[PDB]
Paper text:
Residing in the ER membrane, PGAP1 removes the inositol-linked acyl chain from nascent triacylated GPI-APs (dubbed GPI-AP3) to form the diacylated forms (GPI-AP2). In our quest to find stable proteins suitable for biochemical and structural studies, we identified PGAP1 from Chaetomium thermophilum (cPGAP1), which shares 20.7%/29.1% sequence identity and 33.8%/45.7% similarity with the human/yeast deacylase, respectively. Due to its higher model completeness (81% of its 1183 residues), the cPGAP1S327A structure is used here for structural description. cPGAP1 contains a transmembrane domain (TMD), a lipase domain with a typical α-β-α hydrolase architecture, and a third domain with two jelly-roll subdomains that show a classic β-sandwich fold. The lipase domain of cPGAP1 exhibits a typical α/β hydrolase fold, with an eight-stranded β-sheet sandwiched by α-helices.
Among the three residues in the Ser327-His443-Asp407 triad (which we will discuss later), we initially selected the H443N mutant for two reasons. First, it exhibited only residual activity (0.4% of wildtype) in the FSEC-assay. Second, compared to the S327A mutant, the asparagine replacement of a histidine residue in H443N was expected to cause fewer perturbations to the triad geometry and thus to ligand binding due to the similar volume and solubility between these two residues. Since the yield by mixing the separately purified cPGAP1 with TGP3 was low, we co-expressed Strep-tagged TGP3 and His-tagged cPGAP1 H443N and purified the complex (dubbed cPGAPH443N) using tandem affinity chromatography and gel filtration. The gel filtration profile monitoring absorbance of general proteins (280 nm) and enzyme/ligand (585 nm for PGAP1-mCherry, 493 nm for GPI-anchored TGP), as well as the in-gel fluorescence, indicated co-elution of cPGAP1H443N and TGP2/3. Subsequently, we determined the cryo-EM structure of the liganded complex to a nominal resolution of 2.68-Å. However, the ligand density near the scissile bond was broken. Thus, instead of a triacylated substrate (TGP3), the results supported the fitting of the two products, namely a fatty acid (palmitic acid, PLM) and a diacylated GPI-AP (TGP2). In addition, the PLM carboxyl is distant (5.3 Å) from the inositol 2-OH, where it is attached in TGP3, suggesting the fatty acid had been hydrolyzed. Taken together, the cPGAP1H443N structure represents the product-bound state. In cPGAP1H433N, the 1-alkyl chain tightly associates with the enzyme.
Author numbering:
A (entry chain A): 138 to 873, 895 to 955, 983 to 1094, 1102 to 1150
B (entry chain B): 1 to 4
Write the structure that this text describes.
């Protein structure tokens, strides 16, 4: 019986309805659930660009296509001359050279306002930053690999030209005793950072010409999409280059020994590049770089888009300060040595509470000699926390000396100080100064003059105890201010910004060589401000909840930290590692009894790797979403069991004497929406798994009964046996020193995430049904247009295609034209089948429609190369094409489409061997699309080309 | 500024 192409089974319609339903739920809850606060302040400037037009085709062939600019900021740069450290900004996928605007303008203003007067800073080798930016014509870099290589080659030549600029007296005004620059600092955005890494492997790279790469939201670990084979190969090249170079034991054999790479990720608000791909932990050792999120950068504390990471005001200031702390024009490479650069980057980008954080004060030179009476009024008893409700009660400079406990106790102990008042730098009279004091011997022990050491007379008694004291300002941790009028760690309005808190955290072994911690209260009149300092035991402050993921997802975890709690408490859940699961954190009300608390509770949700910390000021209700173990990225490196999973750091007022409750439960819809960044690229490949299994069932029934069933009927027959079985095979495949372990299927071998295979399968069933109905609608619509033209008329009245591809037409244009000719054949087939309604006309229509669906699901992979080619034609760039690859990638489709235009139906199918070859080919295509589809989506075109050649063979046999 |  004639079965309509539009008819669908109830079983296949319900399954497709769930697939579309689960797609909407994932998409909807990825834009509404667990969304981070937006806290970027817009930045304004006066932009200007000087085109370096002497950098032309004599220097590089690509200079007819690309351009180089020097940023000049109005009010600062009054001429196009280079007077400082050269910095190169690389824009990303379809980015603009005019995106350096914010960061280049802040660098121009900061040197004008502050540094150019700081005479010590210039004497230390600090000059202005010359920001060069490159115009790539908004190239689609993430979708074409030859574009990436061209950009890297152009930029190596551009660095040669930039460094040549500093030799010309007519263009460079610099001190005559300075060395000539031999390096450029590279700041790359998105694909821009990837080009920077590629720049170091290209043949025309000049050695030692890049030593500092800072990338903003760059996918270092993995290509964003794998539609081009050259992108995948270049990622393999650069990732292998970093891994091999840093795996060398002798630094002379390490080409990247002097290179530091810092990767900054926008976070959860970045929906263009997954922040999971920014992790360089599998590429760069901690001595040479790190991955940091903008939510952990002090005085930024916000997540950002892919675009806002450049113009955000807070982050702009932070990055310019970090860049100005590394430059050194006294060295030919215009930066400090590698270790000093790493220390500065850690200071400016990291929270300071990491394990890699370095403490300066404990072993630093003493900066102040303090005189205190022997009456021990200042010296307090051990085990008492120092609480200063107000500053300046007495009206004179005071010293509070806290004795450091002896290290005899086996338990680990920490000294923690929290204040909302800015701590004085050495040699500065402010409101408050904290310093580590060591007792000076009564006997005149031989020592230096202590000329930097200043005096502070506070005794006025015979004792006059002498103390040599080191200011702890170098090691101050800046914490967002958690007052009870604060909602976010940031403030979009600069006027409403609360001055942040100051935090000190020391292990007792670090400061055991000292005798006291001196909190010098310099205020005289009573001024607002609190200081809490105490020593705490690791047992009392740190809690670990060893609860499995199943129990955590079922019941959640609840803690009741006690009232005796130290000011700072940590709660670690080692089983919270996945980036795909989102939680909800609740902190109980601090019932401060009889008094208001000194500050509101502050929570730091953080991960050991990558450096991804999030702050919740006035914490009561926090959305806990983390960037942990992501699906397709290389596996995390070995770590201590004390740094695994998720930890919460809690600061509360300890004087309230009220216990606090911490609850953590799972957010099901937020967890569901976490899947969109991670699995959006599955849908260029994995729906071919469903289509190939449907075409397998259509050909099976045809070869056995002679009837080519509709795509919907084939889908209904496949959902009963074939598709469920092959999803079980995918699950079994997942369960069965390599950095490409997580590149196939779901990318997660973890058996917990096996439900993702049925989830993706059902969503792709729904998507295939919808695309089928779209193709049917398009066929009917074109047929209606043709019939309408016919009625308007009535009432009112070859073998050359091979030559085209070999010369100038890329096979993607030919493929699009083949798809259009196939649509025309489909329209004729449908019209004929409606006119005649023969069983032979239904077979041809169904067969042509299925082949059209197969072609249409490969078209997405080929379209990105078409736009690149059209763009290059617009710019007048011509790219030669290898005739062997173009011809062999398009002839099977050309021949199939021609055969269909002749109207010939596929011959029905030693004969059983030809019958089984079609089944085997379609099964292999389904399995290959499922397994290698995400990472090698460019090979699907070739595989489907092979299947089309097989169909042409079967057509030829009869 | 003059531009954002
Ligand atoms: N003052 C200082 C500052 O400044 P400004 O900026 O002004 O300010 C700010 C702002 O902002 C905004 O606005 C903005 C502005 O602008 C201006 C600018 O402009 C430009 O620039 C630009 C450029 O041009 C562009 N291009 C962009 O770029 C970028 C770059 O930059 C980077 O780097 C990169 O990275 C990227 O990002 C880029 O972008 P794009 O390009 O767009 O990209 C993105 C995308 C891409 O891709 C797409 C596509 C892909 C794929 C596709 C392909 C293929 C496939 C398919 C095919 C087809 C098929 C069919 C057939 C077959 C059938 C079937 C079978 O990407 C994305 O999106 C990603 C994703 C995608 C999608 C996905 C899909 C998938 C699906 C699936 C799903 C499923 C799921 C599953 C699950 C489950 C599992 C289980 O951007 C930039 C910007 O910046 C320039 O200018 P010039 O030069 O002039 O240029 C011109 C031209 N246009 C510069 O200069 C400037 O600046 O404004 C405008 C207006 O006017 C606008 O538009 C913009 O936007 C606003 O605001 C905002 O902001 C921010 C954002 O932005 C935030 O934050 C805030 O809040 C707001 O909202 C305003 O207002 C402001 O003012
Ligand atoms: C994945 C799910 C949501 C499918 C959504 C696609 C839409 C366009 C589909 C779903 C069911 C379809 C209908 C099912 C069957 C018929 C009978 C046929 O004689 C005419 C078309 C008609 C009336 C279809 C029109 C298009 C339709 C409404
Ligand atoms: C058929 C399409 C579905 C599968 C592909 C999913 C597309 C995801 C988009 C990722 C590419 C984003 C382009 C910018 C990349 C960058 O700036 O680095």
């Amino acid at each position: 019986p004639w079965r309509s192409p539009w008819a669908i089974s109830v079983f296949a319609f319900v399954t497709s309805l769930l697939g579309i339903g689960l797609l909407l739920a994932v998409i909807h809850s990825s834009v509404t659930r667990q969304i981070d606060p937006k806290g970027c302040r817009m930045s304004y400037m006066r932009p200007s660009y000087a085109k370096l037009s002497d950098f032309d085709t004599e220097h590089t062939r690509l200079a007819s296509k690309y351009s180089l600019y020097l940023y000049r900021e109005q009010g600062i740069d009054h001429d196009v001359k280079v007077r400082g450290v050269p910095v190169l900004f690389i824009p990303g996928n379809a980015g603009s050279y005019k995106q350096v605007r914010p960061i280049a303008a802040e660098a121009a203003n900061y040197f004008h306002d502050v540094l150019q007067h700081d005479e010590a800073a210039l004497r230390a080798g600090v000059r202005s930053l010359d920001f060069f930016t490159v115009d790539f014509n908004e190239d689609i870099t993430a979708f074409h690999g030859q574009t990436l290589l061209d950009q890297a080659e152009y930029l190596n030549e551009a660095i040669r030209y930039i460094l040549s600029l500093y030799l010309d007296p007519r263009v460079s005004e610099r001190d005559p005793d300075l060395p000539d620059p031999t390096s450029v600092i590279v700041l790359g955005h998105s694909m821009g950072g990837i080009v920077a890494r590629t720049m170091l492997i290209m043949p025309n790279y000049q050695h030692n010409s890049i030593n500092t790469i800072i990338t903003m939201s760059a996918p270092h670990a993995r290509p964003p999409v794998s539609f081009d084979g050259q992108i995948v190969q270049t990622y393999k090249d650069i990732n292998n280059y970093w891994r091999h170079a840093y795996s060398q034991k002798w630094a002379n054999d390490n080409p990247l020994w002097h290179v530091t790479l810092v990767s900054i990720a926008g976070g959860g608000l970045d929906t263009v590049v997954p922040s999971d791909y920014a992790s360089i932990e599998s590429l760069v050792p901690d001595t040479h770089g790190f991955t940091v999120f903008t939510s952990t950068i002090p005085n930024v504390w916000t997540s950002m888009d892919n675009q806002a990471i450049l113009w955000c005001d807070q982050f702009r200031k932070v990055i310019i300060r970090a860049l100005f702390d590394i430059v050194d024009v006294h060295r030919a490479s215009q930066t400090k040595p590698r270790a000093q650069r790493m220390r500065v980057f850690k200071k400016w980008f990291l929270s300071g509470m990491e394990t890699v954080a370095e403490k300066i004060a404990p072993t630093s030179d003493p900066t102040t000699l303090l005189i205190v009476d022997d009456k021990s009024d200042s010296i307090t008893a051990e085990g008492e926390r120092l609480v200063l409700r107000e500053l300046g009660t007495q009206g004179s400079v005071r010293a509070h000396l806290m004795p450091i406990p002896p290290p005899g106790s086996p338990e680990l102990k920490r000294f923690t100080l929290l204040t909302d008042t800015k701590l004085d730098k050495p040699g500065e009279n402010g409101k408050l100064e904290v310093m580590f004091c060591s007792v000076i011997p009564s006997q005149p022990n031989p020592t230096g003059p202590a000329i930097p050491s200043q005096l502070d007379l506070s005794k006025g008694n015979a004792g006059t105890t002498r103390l040599a004291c080191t200011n702890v300002a170098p090691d101050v941790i800046t914490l967002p201010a958690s007052t009870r009028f604060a909602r976010f760690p940031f403030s979009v309005r600069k006027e409403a910004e609360i001055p942040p808190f100051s935090y000190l955290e020391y292990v007792l072994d670090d400061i055991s060589e000292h005798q006291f911690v001196a909190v010098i209260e310099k205020a005289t009149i009573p001024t607002p401000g609190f200081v809490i300092a105490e020593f705490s035991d690791h047992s009392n402050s740190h809690h670990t909840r060893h609860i499995g993921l199943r129990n955590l997802l079922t019941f959640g975890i609840s803690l009741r930290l006690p009232s005796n709690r130290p000011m700072m408490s940590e709660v670690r859940i080692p089983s919270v590692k996945s980036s795909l699961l989102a939680y909800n954190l609740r902190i109980s009300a601090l019932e401060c009894s009889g008094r208001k608390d000194l500050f509101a509770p502050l929570v730091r949700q953080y991960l050991a790797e990558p450096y991804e910390s999030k702050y919740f000021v006035n914490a009561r209700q926090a959305a806990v979403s983390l960037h942990g173990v992501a699906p397709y990225v290389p596996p995390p490196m070995s770590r201590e069991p004390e740094a695994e999973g998720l930890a919460f750091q809690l600061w509360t007022d300890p004087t309230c004497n009220s216990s606090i409750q911490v609850d953590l439960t799972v957010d099901v819809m937020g967890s569901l929406g976490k899947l969109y960044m991670r699995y959006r690229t599955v849908f260029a490949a994995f729906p071919l798994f469903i289509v190939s299994l449907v075409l397998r069932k259509q050909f099976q029934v045809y070869d056995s009964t002679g009837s080519f069933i509709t795509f919907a009927e084939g889908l209904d027959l496949s959902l009963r046996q074939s598709i469920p079985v092959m999803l079980i095979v995918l699950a079994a495949l997942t369960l069965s020193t390599n950095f490409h372990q997580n590149d196939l299927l779901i990318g997660t071998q973890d058996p917990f995430f096996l439900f993702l295979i049925p989830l993706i399968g059902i969503i792709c069933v729904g998507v295939c049904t919808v695309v089928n109905y779209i193709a049917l609608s398009l066929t009917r619509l074109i047929s209606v247009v043709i019939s309408f033209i016919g009625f308007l008329t009535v009432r009112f009245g070859t073998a050359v295609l091979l030559f085209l591809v070999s010369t100038m037409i890329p096979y993607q244009l030919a493929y699009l034209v083949a798809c259009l000719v196939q649509l025309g054949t489909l329209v004729r087939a449908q019209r004929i089948s409606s006119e005649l309604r023969s069983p032979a006309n239904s077979n041809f229509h169904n067969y042509v429609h299925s082949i059209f669906i197969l072609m249409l699901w490969i078209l997405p992979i080929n379209l990105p190369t078409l736009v690149v080619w059209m763009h290059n034609l617009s710019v007048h760039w011509l790219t030669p094409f290898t005739s062997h690859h173009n011809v062999f990638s398009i002839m099977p489709f050309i021949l199939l489409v021609e055969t269909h235009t002749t109207g010939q139906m596929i011959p029905r199918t030693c004969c059983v061997l030809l019958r089984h070859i079609t089944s085997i080919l379609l099964l292999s295509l389904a399995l290959y699309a499922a397994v290698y589809g995400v990472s090698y989506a460019y090979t699907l075109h070739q595989f489907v080309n092979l299947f089309a050649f097989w169909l042409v063979m079967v057509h030829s046999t009869a | 500024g003059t531009t954002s």
